[PDB]
Design a protein around this ligand. Structure first.
Ligand SMILES: NC(=O)c1ccc[n+]([C@@H]2O[C@H](COP(=O)([O-])OP(=O)(O)OC[C@H]3O[C@@H](n4cnc5c(N)ncnc54)[C@H](O)[C@@H]3O)[C@@H](O)[C@H]2O)c1
Ligand SMILES: NC(=O)c1ccc[n+]([C@@H]2O[C@H](COP(=O)([O-])OP(=O)(O)OC[C@H]3O[C@@H](n4cnc5c(N)ncnc54)[C@H](O)[C@@H]3O)[C@@H](O)[C@H]2O)c1
Ligand SMILES: NC(=O)c1ccc[n+]([C@@H]2O[C@H](COP(=O)([O-])OP(=O)(O)OC[C@H]3O[C@@H](n4cnc5c(N)ncnc54)[C@H](O)[C@@H]3O)[C@@H](O)[C@H]2O)c1
Ligand SMILES: NC(=O)c1ccc[n+]([C@@H]2O[C@H](COP(=O)([O-])OP(=O)(O)OC[C@H]3O[C@@H](n4cnc5c(N)ncnc54)[C@H](O)[C@@H]3O)[C@@H](O)[C@H]2O)c1
Ligand SMILES: [Cl-]
Ligand SMILES: [Cl-]
Ligand SMILES: [Cl-]
Ligand SMILES: [Cl-]
Ligand SMILES: [Cl-]
Ligand SMILES: [Cl-]
Ligand SMILES: [Cl-]
Ligand SMILES: [Cl-]
Ligand SMILES: [Cl-]
Ligand SMILES: [Cl-]
Ligand SMILES: [Cl-]
Ligand SMILES: [Cl-]
Ligand SMILES: [Mg+2]
Ligand SMILES: [Mg+2]
Ligand SMILES: [Mg+2]
Ligand SMILES: [Mg+2]
Lengths: 382, 382, 382, 382
């Protein structure tokens, strides 16, 4: 009862996943932050990291342990310690102080994909996890346009995550099945082009955008208010932190993807589009990995009364998502074992803040949780 | 499709219920804050106030409208405008600047009860709502002890709500069925003595303690955290407001009832008794009916990370509960129509912060909501 | 002991100033929010509004009262009720849903200025108050460049406030003295070109940017921390509201003026430039005139300990500044009476968040307050 | 340029003072949290701990280092490491899980005092610091009543701090001068009996109650609001933490001292007694030494507008006060050198939240700071 995992993008999230998982297999900690903890048939010792890819010249060729220790100084070794390999960069790190290298510097995208597939066939992952830098993306919608983009080496059109998910389908087809977990904003689970390519190629997809940070807290409050028929007048959410990833996109890149990165959480939960201010995380270096959040919601109660809630928080970013990933990789192996190719909403609805497919929307997360337990073969919690 | 309602204790909650309901039947407002809004077969025009009782000499003999306007100056008339009648005081207002009068000043408790029953038989309510001053109570547990307390005129042992619920059972028996809604802390739904007396006497009981204020918000956050297996280190809740009721109990009365008024919300939701500070509402006069709340929760996430949430709010007390009551009276008539005597957990679990019976506990309120919709004959919301 | 006041830009601030002042002369309210209240020799009845200018075609030609009632419905008349006159628009309202008209549509800037001066000589104000829409400005630094900009009709170079302050100096010279109060961000007090033009032309200038909102609260906390030698690690400030003015500037206009609109409050108060996030107010329509603010500051205390403060607030924008203006117009008449031409730091330091001249900086506002009292001829408060 | 210091009560504050001071003399840290840092003529290496007293049987006879390491595990040695000596207990620890021992178990109070004085004459402190458990005290007002209480061995009347301050005066007289720093609530600086005894016996007194925690933050906001003539409607302050000292007083002891422990900060700063809720710190064990605070203030601004501020914080208790003590001991030696016997308001006003003498009150702390710098022979900061 094992799961082999390949990581794309060896940064803070990835390194916290690895370091946390090491402590969990070494019993140095309890699985707090891992929702399903030890309830699944796959134990923490049964999760094996078979590979890690990056585009940072400072990381490529280092052992996984050397990079993980840069984020978590207490990690001096790892049970599986593969060397970090070169991926495909496209535009990912163009705005960051990273010296980039990529397969597609010396070959076409189509060639780079075939090269990835060959490498991955030897590493043999069950689950590929995407923790790459946030991207100014535009979805395809039609598979034919994705295929043409690859065929024509259309680098200006594609993002790295789009190329990696494409490669994952080709890999899945050659391997007889695999899973791709997309915890970044780029539409994969929510792009019907990729859901169709996945269904056709023995690939399970979870996505998109890991459910951490302020937005899930806003959504929880909105769910409360909806139940009580309290009319939500406005919602303001502020989120700021010190991770370099928050500077990844130019104002232009943000403008280009805004149509797709805008949250639908408020209308999803309330049923009406209450005015809201929900934006990308701002940058302030000394906060490091621990975000400051501030949320303000005002609403109308009975007899014309008006109430206000102000939520503030300090939340550790990478650990939150790292813990979710411990479940998502094990759930990916279950979905693969069951041949549930395409995207799996019962999983996405709980773990993702933009749950795929495009035709499904966010629900209250307690409801999502109970339905996800049932999908996983567990009894509900309450 | 009608419901006749009798109110016990004509103060802020009661008067907001009445004033709000008047605007709702007059279409001057939408039913925000009324969870089931217009989904029930009983409409707002079909709720008739047939009586109101108090012990304040300043209120007894006034028209309901004259008292309601003291709380909501915009109310200049009411569709049903009964005169406020004298109840039984026992210790209720002993610590407040209220000149008290009570039936039991001129007769025994047993006589006072028979007098109430005779009055109520002429007013003919379906539903009796208890919005009296908070009480230093001690539950009975065994019906025999409740019966002996009444029989022996044991005024030092009993609170007003205990005497009123007893009277409600006798009334229910003479009438062929009625309902008693207890939105104050005193155990009625959670006192097996009263649940048994109710079952035997054609009385439906909802209780105890209306689910408003800070505690339901704390409970919602705890539910979120539990789902994610986040270990809750501590919970602090502060609540303060300007309502006279917050001064009702002496330090001694508080000490006497503390065993029973202590929240179990934290252990109920989490399954372990995380250290917590959750206390009665403090007094600060200029806040009036709009409470200030402050909640702090710290918890452990993945890889030993520690996060913190600080929730602040300004919430209008009496409107919140007033809106719940618009549903509870209609649900009481449904339970009565169905002959569901004793206490009804599917209702209590959503509307009450100490849901009866004593053998049931709090659950996440979204789960309670969906189960309450099903009980009411509605389709679930999400 | 009188002061005649001319308003430039008849919007929310201006209209709250007028409406508030009307209630103060009519004794309908106490001067809360007016720092010096009734301590000055000029009473509220002695402040006369002699004129109001706008560029909104919907406002030009209306009585002041008709426009004020749009903001404060309780105002049905005014003691002085002049018709709103046409100003100069330049780029002010280009990004707003306002149909603009301006003198410079039919004449050169130099001509428009001479026209303003002639109009103002008949209205005869002592004090001109600038409450116009926020502007993408670039200061001059050298008076010669300001003069050339006017002479050459260089509309692309100038903002309305720059043209109005220029006109104010010419007016002051013809009149024998006047004062210009700049409560918007555009550098006037902090542009040596204008300070020199003012000194030479019998003009007193107060500026720049009224001291209201979140920034003064952040500054107060920083002052506290500085005193205790607490090392400030980071400062994050979020501010959002529903006023149309918050949409006045494009991303480009913001980029153009950012060099000058960036706060120096943190380094001014602390002496070192702690990392900070302090940005323009964001837009969320239902908040209206009542801003939501959120501030987070973390700092190092003794023995390596680290503390955190989270401040949230709801603050009414236009009333705050309206109240300051009641003092600033009276202080302007005192400065004029004393012939203190140029800019007056003892006033600016308390009332303005970028106190002029360019060579002076922010100080703790309690210190500024006591020095401002001394300047005004009052005894200090504590 | 040296100062010898004796500590009364070797708990969290005391141990943080010692541990912090050790790091400061060893250059392992900068003096953050020490307001006057290195501006005084006495450097950190020049502060010598000559003694430490307790009543805990678990601490008496231990080296100072062994006790300090229980609070700060990083401390493995101290430059001066005296054995902890037995004090006088009276009622101090009666409500805590501490096995108490005291001189007055085997002798009268008068004898116990003479014994302390003899011990202290050999240890030879310049400055005695009182960091003992909070006490249910009642001040004397008249010195004659203090003298009679000691003479008559009136243990039920006296607290430990009262006996220690008395002993300090007798010690000061025998030594030719000393200083007593009272950072706990018990009136010493604010009890004219002790101020007179001190003046007569060559004793300098600083007191009372160290200026840390939520109250100084509330006071800072109030000072801001007062300046702007904003009318404060209400002030609510919540403070909770995990230190055992918060359980020191029974409800009865709290009732007995309430007349004296009630804050006057609001009226002191505003000049009118705005309704307020400011209470002793509540207990929640897992918070440890890091308090959670919540403050809510609502106020009236211009034109009838109403604003609200909600401040939340996590603040490390013992470090805050520990840092103040680094200054207070050096300032005590300066006051002693100057023969300024009695109490010194210029010091108290900045460092203490109930600044002595009884005839002086709190002022804005920035004003207190500048006056304290002037007293100390420094130039003001801004
Ligand atoms: N709680 C969270 O941290 C959170 C929540 C939801 C989503 N996310 C998303 O997760 C992603 C990772 O976040 P992070 O904080 O770890 O960021 P990070 O910058 O620390 O790490 C990103 C890593 O990806 C590498 N990389 C960039 N482009 C790549 C490419 N084309 N191929 C291979 N490697 C590439 C970078 O060099 C870096 O090592 C981001 O997209 C972020 O938006 C994070
Ligand atoms: N959101 C909320 O307001 C909220 C929430 C949960 C529970 N409650 C509970 O609801 C109750 C009512 O709250 P309120 O704010 O309306 O208080 P309130 O003081 O305004 O009104 C109480 C009324 O009951 C009357 N009364 C007191 N004892 C009585 C007796 N023995 N018989 C008849 N009348 C009596 C009083 O004179 C007064 O008119 C309290 O027990 C409170 O704890 C309130
Ligand atoms: N608390 C506060 O409201 C606050 C604080 C500091 C500064 N300010 C500044 O005060 C100014 C006014 O704020 P507001 O909320 O009243 O905005 P507003 O949009 O309500 O009013 C601005 C008015 O100026 C008019 N106007 C625009 N350009 C003009 C021009 N060139 N000549 C004459 N009239 C012109 C507009 O038509 C409108 O009537 C803004 O610059 C704002 O940044 C406001
Ligand atoms: N920021 C702060 O910690 C803060 C601020 C202001 C005031 N204070 C006050 O400082 C005092 C110390 O606080 P703490 O947190 O260090 O408490 P603590 O309980 O950790 O330490 C108190 C110590 O005093 C000892 N003690 C008790 N009675 C004594 C007696 N009669 N003689 C000698 N020793 C005695 C105890 O055994 C213990 O070692 C308390 O009065 C507290 O109210 C603390
Ligand atoms: Cl999270
Ligand atoms: Cl977020
Ligand atoms: Cl949710
Ligand atoms: Cl509520
Ligand atoms: Cl509450
Ligand atoms: Cl819940
Ligand atoms: Cl303000
Ligand atoms: Cl602001
Ligand atoms: Cl300041
Ligand atoms: Cl502090
Ligand atoms: Cl405190
Ligand atoms: Cl202060
Ligand atoms: Mg979707
Ligand atoms: Mg129960
Ligand atoms: Mg300046
Ligand atoms: Mg005093």
């Amino acid at each position: 009862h094992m799961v082999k995992v390949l990581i794309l993008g060896q940064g803070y999230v990835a390194s916290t996943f690895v370091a946390g998982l090491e402590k969990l297999r070494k019993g140095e900690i309890e699985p707090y932050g891992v929702p399903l903890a030890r309830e699944l048939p796959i134990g923490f010792e049964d999760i094996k990291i078979v590979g890690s890819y990056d585009v940072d010249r400072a990381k490529i060729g280092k052992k996984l342990s050397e990079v993980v220790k840069q984020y978590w100084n207490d990690v001096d070794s790892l049970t599986s310690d593969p060397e970090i390999r070169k991926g495909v960069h496209l535009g990912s790190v163009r705005n960051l102080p990273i010296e980039a290298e990529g397969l597609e510097d010396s070959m076409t995208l189509k060639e780079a994909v075939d090269t990835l597939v060959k490498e991955w066939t030897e590493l043999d992952p069950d689950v590929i996890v995407n923790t790459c830098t946030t991207e100014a993306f535009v979805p395809f919608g039609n598979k034919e346009d994705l295929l043409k983009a690859i065929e024509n080496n259309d680098k200006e059109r594609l993002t790295a995550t789009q190329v990696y998910a494409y490669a994952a389908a080709l890999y899945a087809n050659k391997r007889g099945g695999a899973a791709f977990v997309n915890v970044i904003p780029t539409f994969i689970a929510n792009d019907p082009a990729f859901v169709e390519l996945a269904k056709e190629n023995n690939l399970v997809v979870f996505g998109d955008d890991g459910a951490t940070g302020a937005t899930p807290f806003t959504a929880d409050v909105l769910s409360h208010l909806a139940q009580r028929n309290r009319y939500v007048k406005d919602v303001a959410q502020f989120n700021i932190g010190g991770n370099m990833d928050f500077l990844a996109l130019t104002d232009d890149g943000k403008n280009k993807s805004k149509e797709f990165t805008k949250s639908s959480i408020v209308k999803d939960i309330l049923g009406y589009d209450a005015p809201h201010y929900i934006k990308p995380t701002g940058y302030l270096e000394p906060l490091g990995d621990k975000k400051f959040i501030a949320i303000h919601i005002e609403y109308v109660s009975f007899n014309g009364a008006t109430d206000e809630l102000m939520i503030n928080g300090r939340i550790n970013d990478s650990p939150a998502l790292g813990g979710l990933l411990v479940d998502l990789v094990r759930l990916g192996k279950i979905a693969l074992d069951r041949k549930e190719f395409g995207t799996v909403y019962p999983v996405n609805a709980f773990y993702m803040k933009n749950p795929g497919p495009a035709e499904e929307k966010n629900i209250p997360r307690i409801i999502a949780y109970e339905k996800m337990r049932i999908w996983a073969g567990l009894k509900p919690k309450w």
